[PDB]
Amino acid sequence: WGDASNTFFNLILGGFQNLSEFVTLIVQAVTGAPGGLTDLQAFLTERWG
Amino acid sequence: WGDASNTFFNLILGGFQNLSEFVTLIVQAVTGAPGGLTDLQAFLTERWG
Amino acid sequence: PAADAIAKLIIETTGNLLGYFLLGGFSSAGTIAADIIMPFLVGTIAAWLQWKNTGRATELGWVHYWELYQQGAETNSWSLAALAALRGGFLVGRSETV
Hints:
Order of helices and strands of chain C: HHH
Radius of gyration of chain A: 15 Å
Radius of gyration of chain C: 21 Å
Number of helices of chain A: 3
Helix content of chain A: over 70%
Largest sheet of chain A: none
Distance between the termini of chain A: 51 Å
Number of helices of chain C: 3
Structural class of chain C: mainly alpha
Strand content of chain C: under 5%
Structural class of chain A: mainly alpha
Strand content of chain A: under 5%
Largest interface: A-B, 15 and 13 residues
Oligomer: part of a larger assembly
Distance between the termini of chain C: 40 Å
């Protein structure tokens, strides 16, 4: 079970515990302000405008 | 099993059903036109041009 | 069987272990588990019924035989009828006149 946990959380999930924090990481990588996917879309829309 | 399902589909996977749906959401957030990763690359490349 | 039936031991323990795993219990011991050790306690939780016959003790007195293990005609029915199983067990060692 410990080996399965290592495989699931390190290999399959990368270095991310879940998908929500990974979304936040994507938002922080493409935008200065941290936030959700809506925040990402808003910042990108402002940039394109 | 119900608690495990809640944890998997809400915590680990966020609010997204699957990675394909999450990819579509990322493409819709960063580009106006929905589509796959190829569509994201195409829109961003024409915007680069 | 109401505590450690094989269906319980498989399904419920697998679900509990999967929930613990998804929370990250095996990644780090911080998580609090919910009955992931049920197969380890097979035949130990509420597995017996002991009854002391007070009337028999009063009849017999200070010196008496203590206890007797009794197996029913149906080996998996005492949990269904505890009282009937106990009375069937007490059917054995009683005062007898012929």
